[PDB]
Amino acid sequence: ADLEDNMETLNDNLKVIEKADNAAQVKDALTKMRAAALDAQKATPPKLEDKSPDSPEMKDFRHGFDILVGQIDDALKLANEGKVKEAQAAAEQLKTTRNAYHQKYR
Structure with a gap:
């Protein structure tokens, strides 16, 4: 159990x-991740406790998504701009942040 938050909306996409992946399909799937991902980042991910007890807490979260939510967008305009024909190659690649984030709460 972790960001069960952004994850709950992640299971949808x-x-x-x-089964989805084509241009239109994968095109709609991404949009869902973009709107959903924007919620996790824009949403107060209290899971880790926003009450930034130390200080540099929040800003610390804008880093995780900032990177992920940053790739999802490049995956959309990439398939609608024709990065879709060559994308099929990245779709089989995957993203699982190379730095397999910790299991969850360290």
Whole structure:
């Protein structure tokens, strides 16, 4: 159990992603991740406790998504701009942040 938050909305696209992938499909799947991802980042991810007890807490979260939510967008305009024909190659690649984030709460 972790960001069960952004994850709950992730299972939706993560699923429609399996059978989905073509241009229109994968095109709609991403949009969902963009609107959903924007919520996790824009949403107060209290899971880790926003009450930034130390200080540099929040800003610390804008880093995780900032990177992920940053790739999702490049995956959309990339498929609608024709990065879709060559994308099919990245779709099989995956993203799982190379730095397999910790299991969750360290």
